[PDB]
Every structure is written in structure tokens, then in C-alpha cells.
DNA sequence: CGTACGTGCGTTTAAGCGGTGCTAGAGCTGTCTACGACCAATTGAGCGGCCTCGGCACCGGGATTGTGAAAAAAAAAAGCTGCA
């Protein structure tokens, strides 16, 4: 009768994104396992590339510029273009919401 | 068995050297504050747990697709000449 320990996952957000993308389409347990393995992976790859960018330039802080550079380094062409576009929107919209 | 490449010639080219002169820009300083750590207190987003019900796995049965043989038609190909 102990409550089971927490296990975070991006799965509520994957669903919310899916419901934008294809409102009438769902996803199996194991397909979610993968979408989660993905998000974590690309997270770890970008954070890691952004870490090294900072570290090379003798920088204490990983800013949104070290992410963007790390995104250009990591992503293929049109993914990178679109990935930067959506990132740069997000920060602009954040700042105008104070 | 055909000609694509390696060899080796003579001719041509610009890489490499060693040097000189100009300056963009790498990299350093010192200054100063906007921003991020840390903090505590506050609170609602996301967790586990639970219950439901519709998608999809599983089924049988018939429709449609794809292969291979067999017999048959078309096919190149094979032993025989003449005529020059
Ligand atoms: Ca500043
Ligand atoms: Ca749940
Ligand atoms: Ca349902």
C-alpha cells in the first residue's frame, strides 16, 4: 500500500503536441517509450553541445545563444532552420510576457 | 580479346622559399550592473491510481494476385549441300 515512486516523462506534453498535430490520432504505450527516449536524447545532445560551446569560450553561463549555436551544429539543414525559427519565437514571446 | 591504365620520355608550370611592409583583429585590460544563484514561502501542474470502452488483434471465408508447369508457338541455331 506504499504509493509507487514518481517517474517523470514528457508523455503528457507529447500527447498535447500530438493533439495539435493530429487531433484524431493516438499513440501506444511503446510508441510513447520511444518519443520519450527521443526527447531525452536530443535534450542530452544539445545541452552537451551547449556545455562545450560555453566551456570553450570560457563562459560560466549557457545562454539561449549557446543553445542556438548547438542546434545549428547538431541538426540537419531544414530542421535546424525551423528549429532556430521556433526557438527565437519562443524567447521573444517570453520576454514580452515579462 | 579489347583498350584502360602504368611507364617514361620532353616540356611547362607555379609551389615553395625567404624576405619585406602593412594593419585587421585577437586578445588583454579595467569598469559596473543587469542577471542568475540562492533563498524561503506559496501553490497548482503533473504524478500514481483507478475505472471504461472502443481500437485492434484474431478469426474465418471468399476475392484477387502471382508463379510455374505443360503444351505449343516462335525462335535462333545446327548438320548438309551446291556452285563458284
Ligand atoms: Ca550585462
Ligand atoms: Ca495516467
Ligand atoms: Ca477510449
UniProtKB/Swiss-Prot annotation:
GO biological process: antibacterial humoral response; antimicrobial humoral immune response mediated by antimicrobial peptide; chromatin organization; defense response to Gram-negative bacterium; defense response to Gram-positive bacterium; innate immune response in mucosa; killing of cells of another organism; negative regulation of tumor necrosis factor-mediated signaling pathway
S-S bridge residues: none
Post-translational modification Phosphoserine, affected residues: 9
Residue positions where N6-(2-hydroxyisobutyryl)lysine is found in the record: 7, 16, 19, 30, 58, 81, 89, 93
Location of N6-crotonyllysine modifications: 7
Modification PolyADP-ribosyl glutamic acid occurs at: 8
Main location: nucleus
Phosphothreonine modified-residue sites: 88
One Gene Ontology MF term: lipopolysaccharide binding
Modification N6-methyllysine occurs at: 19, 81
Modified residues (N6-glutaryllysine): 7, 16, 19, 81, 89, 93
Protein name: Histone H2B type 1-J
Organism: Homo sapiens
Amino acid at each position: 500500500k506504499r504509493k509507487r515512486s514518481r517517474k517523470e516523462s514528457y508523455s503528457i506534453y507529447v500527447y498535447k503536441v500530438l493533439k495539435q498535430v493530429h487531433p484524431d490520432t493516438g499513440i501506444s504505450s511503446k510508441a510513447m517509450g520511444i518519443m520519450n527516449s527521443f526527447v531525452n536524447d536530443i535534450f542530452e545532445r544539445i545541452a552537451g553541445e551547449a556545455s562545450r560551446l560555453a566551456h570553450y569560450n570560457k563562459r560560466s553561463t549557457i545562454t539561449s545563444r549557446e543553445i542556438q549555436t548547438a542546434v545549428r551544429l547538431l541538426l540537419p539543414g531544414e530542421l535546424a532552420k525551423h528549429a532556430v525559427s521556433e526557438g527565437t519565437k519562443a524567447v521573444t514571446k517570453y520576454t514580452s510576457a515579462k
